[PDB]
Amino acid sequence: SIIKIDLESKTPIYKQIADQIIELIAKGELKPGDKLPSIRELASMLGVNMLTVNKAYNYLVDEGFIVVQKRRYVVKSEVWRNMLRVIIYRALAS
Amino acid sequence: IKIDLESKTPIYKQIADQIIELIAKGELKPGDKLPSIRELASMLGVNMLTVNKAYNYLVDEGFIVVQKRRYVVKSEVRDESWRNMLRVIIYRALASNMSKDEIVNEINRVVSEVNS
């Protein structure tokens, strides 16, 4: 009920998981250092296969919002503009 | 586009960020098209598995879109996909210890900037 899986959105499930984990980090409901649920504990929480959560947790690792602390997932601690620049550009070019 | 083989950043992420740079820096732009998965996988010395992933990373982020069998810089605005990307921008901003006063102060600074 914290992470809403939107089954008819066209955002892939793993990406809605990741997006919402970022929102929760943004909202501060997940402070830094906060260990995350297991891949298995979160999949079952959501009704989802571990693979989709795996993909979600890895997306968050490459993007730099969580980190692995000997095989457990933890919110990191530090430091999207190019994203803005491309949509203004896409905006004004209309 | 150059692949730093020794960096800890993943290859697909390297490719993606560099292309995003081109889209952002105007050097790549709405309606433009990108090399085939294989053309790029052959320009670079990289197998097509991680090139495919790079492209599908740009698709999910919202940057490009398959049009015929072609990966194409997104041109379409006013839709809901437009609005999602914004939310991601402010959401990722807030999640990097930025004020809300801060972020939108800096949003205006980039809109004005490129109306060049």
Author numbering:
A (entry chain A): 3 to 81, 85 to 99
B (entry chain B): 5 to 120
Paste lines from the article:
The thermoacidophilic model crenarchaeote Sulfolobus acidocaldarius is predicted to harbor a gene encoding a putative GntR-type TF belonging to the YtrA subfamily. Closer inspection of the amino acid sequence encoded by the concerned gene (Saci_1851) learned that the C-terminal E-O domain of this 121-amino acid protein consists of about 50 amino acids predicted to fold into two α-helices, thus classifying it as a member of the YtrA subfamily. YtrASa performs an (auto-)repression function by interacting with high specificity and affinity with a 32-bp long inverted repeat. YtrASa represses the transcription of an operon encoding its own gene and a membrane protein and of a second gene encoding a membrane protein by interacting with a binding site that fully covers the transcription initiation site.
A crystallographic analysis of YtrASa yielded a structure at 3.0 Å resolution. The 14-kDa YtrASa protein crystallized as a dimer with the asymmetric unit of the crystal structure containing a homodimer with an exclusive α-helical structure. Each monomeric unit displays an N-terminal DNA-binding domain harboring the typical GntR-like wHTH motif (α1–α3) and a short C-terminal E-O domain, consisting of two α helices (α4–α5) that mediate dimerization, which is a typical feature for YtrA-like regulators. Upon comparing the YtrASa structure with that of the only described bacterial YtrA-type crystal structure, CGL2947 of C. glutamicum, major structural differences are observed despite the similar topological organization. The distance between the two monomeric Arg42 residues, located in wHTH domain, amounts 36 Å, which is similar to the length of one turn of the DNA helix. This is only about half of the distance between corresponding monomeric residues in the C. glutamicum YtrA structure. For one of the YtrASa chains, the α5 helix could not be modeled due to poor electron density, likely explained by a flexible behavior of these C-terminal helices within the crystal. Furthermore, the alignment of individual monomeric chains from within the same dimer demonstrated that the E-O domain has an asymmetric nature. Although these observations might be ascribed to the crystal packing and are not necessarily biologically relevant, the short length of α4 underlies a compact E-O domain regardless of its exact conformation and a shorter distance between the two monomeric DNA-binding domains in comparison to other YtrA-like regulators.
